[PDB]
Each structure stands twice: as structure tokens, then as C-alpha cells.
Amino acid sequence: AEETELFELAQAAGGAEVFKILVDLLKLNVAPLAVFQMLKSMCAG
């Protein structure tokens, strides 16, 4: 699962919760645009 690597890239993000479960969808050949618009809609509420 690259858990250590997942944490390493999480630190690399260096932003301000995990949310890295989302990477699984990337592993399942999901469209990046679709997930981004999903995030936008989720923010909109």
C-alpha cells in the first residue's frame, strides 16, 4: 500500500485528517477531472 510512501507524499504536500484514501481511486484509473469536480462540489455543499 506504500503506507510509508503515502505518508512521505502527504508530508511533501506540506499544507496547513488523512484523505489519502482518495489515492485508491487514482489506482483504479479514475479521471482526474472527475475527482477534482467531485472535490469542488463537495466544497460547494
Partner: protein, 797 residues
């Protein structure tokens, strides 16, 4: 299996703790339309990089982290970087995510309050971990481990183990060139000494301080060749072990050949030096080609080792590097040689898995991973495992240029496996070897034609040695009537004991009667009757289907857990047929298909049993043949009711026979004859079962319940009437006082039940369109004797 997306998105929604809106379910539907068995997310990572950098508050950190991740060459990096880059374009989205993270962290905190690096050791740990993983995965075969002394007896691989300050310039230059000659072969010199370092890299070389600045700088410019030689010798020696797969060993052999050629070059330089007519400039010019070549090889080796990549993913990395070095002659040729060598074993395995379908997994790096499983298990267990977790695709290892045809490969091989385990495999008429090619059209075309050949031969095999057509003809003969003699004899021989309690039923006598009827008939032409058995399923249609349908509202555990043991079951309900067939012969007949078939057969058989009961009731009463028809009141009124029931059952059975059997059977038998692969016939059979189960409309609680009520009340009337007839006959308690104008009460209940059923049918049809129910109602009330009541009832609802 493929439902991980739903669980992940549900967890995401729960974590975000948002209830407003329609949720991600529509978004789940949108995501479902981007399915592929591989990845094709290759996009402009440069654009995402620049978009992040322009906003990156600490650019150096991001740059170093991204470069390191690239060095590891891990997948999923491109889409993740894409998402990160486009994230900051929506500042509101970023603020929302930050607020959610703060809330989650605060909630977790509240809940908690209330409630240098040696290289040898690293290599040893890596090899030990890989050995452990491969031993775990193997699980049933000997471990191909090597003796420990291979790493011992050091210096076998070839790693490293007088004043000159005032000397003349030429003399010191000659000494330095001699030392270099001895060091270019990775052997310690006298004035230049390799030194151990910290971390994974080349070895630093120290020289005497008194040596001239210019000469020492020049030899520093020279030594990268020696450093690359040291790194490549370490790579080749340490990667020679069995546990690193075949492809890595092909790479190792190529490196060995190239380094042998380099040794030839350096010894030729030595023999030229023997004449003592060489200097720094000459050797510096001479080494430049080999210098660049060894730079390339060192880069390849360090990248591969730092990525810890093994298998087809290694081929992907090598191909990516080759393309990245496009436009350079010697680099391109070297990469072509290395990739051909690496692909040789991989392409051998691919051809073996494509043409003969024989899987060979010395360490399980091939693109098809096989999971241990059995065949009788799926025939016994309802859960689907064989075609889902037997021959799966490994995504951690992927071939860069085969992704677009990855999934197809799987199917091909699996087809062969079916004809492999059957022990009837033959060499393919075409056996053209597959070879590495910079382009891709040739191999995609060849695998496509191989797939077509495999599909056609598998279909021919099914039509041949397995005769799926005959088995389907048989399974249509049984479970679906059209064996009138067989069914009538079976009923006549089984009715007497069919009413006994199940606990008193032993299927031995049931099967004895079955075989007696089979031998006492003329339907033995079928040669596949020997794969049938009689079972007593411990549940009925009504309860089984109500549990199946009425779920997730209030009945998840309300009445599903109720055990029939608390009640008594008769021999008519549990009775059913089961079919057992071998794996190679008609694998399509799955336990799921058996369940559908048995459900449909038991429903149809119960309807036939009700019809038989009504016909027997008609048979019993004949004393009124030449006696008073009008008199006898309730000994003669029942007549009308019986007529009604008969017509009713007749209607429905006709709708079940001609309006279900004919369409689905014809479409199946037609489309199957044009089926191309096994998936085609599988889909055709699934659609056949769908059509059959939808025709009877057994996919709704209310209609099933009302139909079952009608059947139960009609059966109760039949048995009560036969009780009355028996009581009258024996003369010519509850039984003696069972008549109080019983016919009137039975009709009063039945007419209301039937009108309610028709109202339900009409209401559901008005929203479900279709014409099957239209034909049902048309045949139910063809004449006007029973029309006005339905309209009057429908008027007030």
C-alpha cells in the same frame, strides 16, 4: 472486488460530515464511466509542476520531494500531482478542506482527551524481505535460495579492497597514468585510493596533496568512469541472485557482456601504453565513448536499484529511459540492445502464456497472477471466485507499452487454461514468435489475431467435446415442462408421499421413484439424465423471495432470522431438483444458474400441482352426471367456482409457457449460434435467466404476496371440498361442521383477492408500460361475464 470505489466514497462523505445535496452517488455514476483495466493518465506533469511552483511557498522542498518520488518511479504520481496543481485554483475548495481538517483534528483531540547509512545492511534487509515475500507467495513449492558464500569470499565480484611531490613532471604523469590504468579496472592503485562513503553512491577517490592542481583536476574529470564501473560491478554482483527475477538477470548478463568489452578496451589501452608512448590527453580522448556509455549504464543501474523495481515494470522503466534518450544514436542503440535482452525472457513467458496458455511464475512477475482455488468449491458455494480471483491482473507490475491491450491478454490465456486443464490442448497453427519492437502495431495485431483464434477454438471445443447445445436442450426439457409424460408420471407417483412432513422425507425413495419413472417411459433418448438429483430446500418461494426483496427498509433483521424449524414444512415446498456437472463440461451452468432454474421450476411445478388438484376435484364429482343438476345446492353451486379457478390457472400457465419460453428460448438459441467468445454466451445465458424471471414478475413483494394468497386459498378450498365429498361418500367434529354455505365464503374471499390482484397489476403496468400484463389481462377476461366489476373497483381507489 470492483466495489472499493463505493466504500471509499462513502467513507469520504462520512469523514467530511456533509448531509446537504444529493451526495456523491450521482458523482459515483459519473466516475463509473471512466473504467479501464490499466492506467492512461499520462498528462503534462510539467504544467502541474509549474502551477504548483508558482504557488509553492517553499519551492525547494517541493522540488526535492518530487524529484525523489520520480527517482522511486512510483505510479499514481502523475494524477496526484495534477490534482494538487489544480487544487489551489479553487481557493474556496482549499479553505473548505482546511476547515474540515481542523474540525476533524479538534474532534480527535477532544475524543482522546475524554477517552552513516551502511549499504551492506540495507541490501541484506532488502534481499531478506524479498525472499520472505516470495516464500509467502509461493506457498507449496521449494524455495530457490543460494548458498550464503556467494556473498562471501569477497573480492570475487571485483570491488575495491614513495614520494612524488618533488618528482619530475613527466615521471609523475607516467605514474599517475599507470595508477589510473590499474584503477579503471576497479583495482586500488598506489597514489589514488578509493574510500568508503555514506549513503548509496559511488566511491570517492583520494590522491596525494602534493600532486599538481591541474593534473589532479584532470584525473578528477577522468574518474567518473571508475565510479560508474564500481557502481555497475556492485549492481551486477548483488543483482545476480535468483530472487530478483528473470528480467533483472537478463539485464545483468547484458551488463556483464558490456563490461567485458570495456575490459577488452582497457587492456588494449594497456598494451598500447606498454610501448610507453601515451599521456593524459590521449587516454582522455580515447575513453570518452566508453565514458558516456558507462555513465548511461550507471544511471540505469542506480535508477533500477533505488526504485526496487522488478518484473514488467522494469521493462516499462527501461522503455521510458530509451524513449527519453531518443535522438541520440549510440544511446538509442545501447537502449535497444538492453531492452531486447531484458524482454527476451519476458517475451518467452508471454508467448508461452499466449499460444499454449501455460503459466510459468518462477517468482510471479508475469502480468497474470494465479490464485490457488478449486473447482468443486464454486459448484458448491454460491459466491463468485473463479473468474474473478483466479487469474487476476497485477497492477504493481505493468508493461508500459502493453497497457492498451493488457486486459485482452488475460482473456486469451484464461481461455487456453480451460482447454489446458481439460487435457486436450494442441499446438496453435501459427507459432510466430513475439519480438520487441519500438513501434506497437505489429504485436497488438498479433495478439489480437491470437485472441480471435483462441476464442474460435474454444467455442469449437464447447460445441464439440462438451456439446453445450445438447446440455442446454436437456436443461430446457427438464425444469421447464415439455416432458408431459415424464411430469404426469412423476406427479402420479409422488403425490401420495408429497404431503408428508419434510422431517419424515428421505430422498432415497424420491430418487428411486424418479429413476423408476425414467425407465418406465420413452424419453430416454437424452444421454444426460444422469446428472440430476432431488433435494429438499429448507425454505419456500414466498418466504425466500420476501426475504430477498423486502430489505433495507425495516426488515433487514425483523423477520429474516426467523427459522422454519419453529414451524412444520410439508414435502411439497422443499422439494426441488438439482444438477451437477463437471468443470470442463458446461462450466456455464453455475450454482447461481442452478438457483434460478430451481426457483423457476418449483414455481411452475407448484402451479402445475394446483392445476392437477383442480382437475382431480373435477374428476371426483360425477354422481351428478344423470342426477338433479339444479338441486343439492352447495353440492352443486361449487361448480361455478371451479370453472373460474380453472380458467384463471389456465390463463396464467399459458402466459408462462408461450409468452416466456418461446421468446427467451428463441433469442438465446439464435444469439448463441452467433456467439464469438465465452463472455458472449455467458451474457446470453444471463439475459435468458433475466427474461424468464422477469416474465413471471417475481421481482415485487406485493404481487408475489397476493399471488401466494390466491394459491393458498384455492388450495384450501380444494382440500375442504374433497373433505366434504369424502364425508358425503362414506355416509352414502370440525369436518362435520365445516359447511355453513362454505362456497359462499370462499367465493367472497377469492373474488376480492382476485380483483385486488388485478388492480395491483393495472396500477403497476400503468407505470411499467410493457404489454405482457396487457396480454395477461386480455386473456383473463376475454368475455364480458367478469368485466364491469374491475372497472367499478378501479373507479374508486
Amino acid at each position: 472486488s470492483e466495489f472499493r470505489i463505493h466504500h471509499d466514497v462513502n467513507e469520504l462523505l462520512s469523514l467530511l460530515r456533509v448531509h446537504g445535496g444529493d451526495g456523491a452517488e450521482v458523482y459515483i455514476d459519473l466516475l463509473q464511466k471512466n473504467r479501464t483495466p490499466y492506467v492512461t493518465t499520462t498528462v503534462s506533469a510539467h504544467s502541474a509542476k509549474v502551477k504548483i511552483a508558482e504557488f509553492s511557498r517553499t519551492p525547494e522542498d517541493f522540488l526535492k520531494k518530487y524529484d525523489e518520488l520520480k527517482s522511486k518511479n512510483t505510479r499514481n504520481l502523475d494524477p496526484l500531482v495534477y490534482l494538487l496543481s489544480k487544487l489551489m485554483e479553487d481557493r474556496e475548495t482549499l479553505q473548505y478542506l482546511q476547515q474540515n481538517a481542523k474540525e476533524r483534528a479538534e474532534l480527535a483531540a477532544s475524543a482522546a482527551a475524554s477517552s552513516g547509512p551502511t549499504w551492506q545492511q540495507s541490501l541484506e534487509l532488502t534481499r531478506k524481505m524479498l525472499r520472505d515475500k516470495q516464500s509467502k507467495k509461493n506457498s507449496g513449492q521449494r524455495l530457490p535460495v543460494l548458498p550464503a558464500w556467494v556473498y562471501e569470499r569477497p573480492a570475487l565480484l571485483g570491488d575495491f579492497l614513495v614520494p612524488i611531490g618533488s618528482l619530475p613532471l613527466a615521471s609523475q604523469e607516467a605514474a599517475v597514468v599507470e595508477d589510473l590504468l590499474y584503477v579503471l579496472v576497479g583495482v586500488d592503485g598506489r597514489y589514488i585510493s578509493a574510500q568508503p562513503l555514506t549513503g548509496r553512491q559511488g566511491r570517492t577517490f583520494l590522491v596525494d596533496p602534493n600532486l599538481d592542481l591541474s593534473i589532479r583536476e584532470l584525473v578528477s574529470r577522468i574518474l567518473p568512469v571508475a565510479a560508474s564501473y564500481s557502481t555497475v560491478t556492485r549492481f551486477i554482483e548483488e543483482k545476480s541472485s535468483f530472487e530478483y527475477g528473470q528480467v533483472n538477470h537478463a539485464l545483468a548478463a547484458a551488463m556483464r557482456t558490456l563490461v567485458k568489452e570495456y575490459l577488452v578496451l582497457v587492456t588494449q589501452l594497456e598494451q598500447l601504453q606498454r610501448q610507453g608512448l601515451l599521456s593524459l590527453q590521449k587516454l582522455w580522448f580515447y575513453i570518452q565513448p566508453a565514458m558516456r556509455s558507462l555513465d548511461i549504464l550507471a544511471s540505469l543501474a542506480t535508477s533500477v536499484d533505488k526504485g526496487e523495481c522488478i518484473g514488467g515494470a522494469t521493462l516499462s522503466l527501461l522503455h521510458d529511459r530509451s524513449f527519453s534518450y531518443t535522438g541520440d544514436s549510440q544511446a538509442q542503440e545501447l537502449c535497444l540492445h538492453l531492452t531486447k535482452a531484458a524482454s527476451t525472457p519476458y517475451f518467452e513467458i508471454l508467448e508461452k502464456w499466449i499460444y499454449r496458455g501455460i503459466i510459468d511464475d518462477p517468482y510471479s512477475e508475469f502480468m497474470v497472477e494465479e490464485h490457488e482455488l478449486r473447482k468443486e468449491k464454486i459448484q458448491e458455494d454460491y459466491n463468485d471466485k473463479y473468474w474473478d480471483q483466479r487469474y487476476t491482473v497485477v497492477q504493481r507490475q505493468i508493461p508500459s507499452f502493453l497497457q492498451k491491450m493488457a486486459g485482452k491478454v488475460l482473456s486469451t490465456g484464461k481461455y487456453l487454461n480451460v482447454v489446458r486443464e481439460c487435457g486436450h490442448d494442441v499446438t496453435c497453427p501459427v507459432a510466430k514468435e513475439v519480438v520487441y519492437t519500438l513501434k506497437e502495431r505489429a504485436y497488438v495485431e498479433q495478439i489480437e489475431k491470437a485472441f480471435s483464434y483462441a476464442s474460435k477454438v474454444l467455442l469449437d471445443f464447447l460445441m464439440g467435446e462438451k456439446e453445450l447445445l445438447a446440455h442446454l436442450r436437456s436443461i430446457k426439457r427438464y425444469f421447464l415442462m415439455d416432458q408431459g409424460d415424464f411430469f404426469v408420471h412423476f406427479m402420479d407417483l409422488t403425490e401420495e408421499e408429497l404431503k408428508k412432513p419434510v422431517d419424515d422425507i428421505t430422498p432415497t425413495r424420491l430418487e428411486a421413484l424418479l429413476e423408476l419413472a425414467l425407465r418406465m417411459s420413452t424419453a430416454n433418448t437424452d444421454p444426460f439424465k444422469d446428472d440430476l438429483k432431488i433435494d429438499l430446500m429448507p425454505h419456500d418461494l414466498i418466504t425466500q423471495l420476501l426475504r430477498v426483496l423486502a430489505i433495507e427498509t425495516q426488515q433487514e433483521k425483523a423477520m429474516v432470522h426467523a427459522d422454519p424449524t419453529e414451524l412444520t414444512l410439508s414435502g411439497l415446498e422443499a422439494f426441488s431438483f438439482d444438477y451437477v456437472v463437471t468443470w470442463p463440461l458446461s462450466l456455464i451452468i453455475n450454482r447461481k444458474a442452478l438457483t434460478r432454474y430451481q426457483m423457476l421450476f418449483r414455481h411452475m411445478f407448484y402451479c402445475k400441482h394446483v392445476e392437477r388438484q383442480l382437475c382431480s376435484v373435477w374428476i371426483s364429482n360425477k354422481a351428478a352426471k344423470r342426477f338433479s343438476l339444479h338441486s343439492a345446492k352447495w353440492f352443486a353451486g361449487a361448480f361455478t367456482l371451479r370453472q373460474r379457478m380453472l380458467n384463471f390457472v389456465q390463463n396464467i400457465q399459458s402466459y408462462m409457457m408461450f409468452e416466456v419460453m418461446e421468446p427467451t428460448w428463441h433469442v438465446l438459441e439464435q444469439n448463441l449460434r452467433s456467439a464469438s467468445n465465452i463472455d458472449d454466451v455467458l451474457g446470453h445465458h444471463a439475459s435468458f435467466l433475466d427474461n424468464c424471471l422477469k416474465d413471471c414478475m417475481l421481482t415485487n413483494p406485493e404481487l408475489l404476496r397476493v399471488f401466494s394468497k390466491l394459491m393458498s386459498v384455492c388450495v384450501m378450498f380444494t382440500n375442504c371440498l374433497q373433505r366434504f365429498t369424502q364425508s358425503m361418500k362414506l355416509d352414502s367434529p370440525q369436518l362435520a361442521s365445516s359447511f355453513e354455505a362454505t362456497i359462499t365464503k370462499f367465493d367472497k374471499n377469492f373474488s376480492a383477492h382476485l380483483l385486488d390482484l388485478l388492480a395491483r397489476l393495472s396500477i403497476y403496468s400503468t407505470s411499467d408500460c410493457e404489454h405482457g400484463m396487457a396480454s395477461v389481462i386480455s386473456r383473463l377476461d376475454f368475455n364480458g361475464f367478469y368485466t364491469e366489476r374491475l372497472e367499478r373497483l378501479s373507479a374508486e381507489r
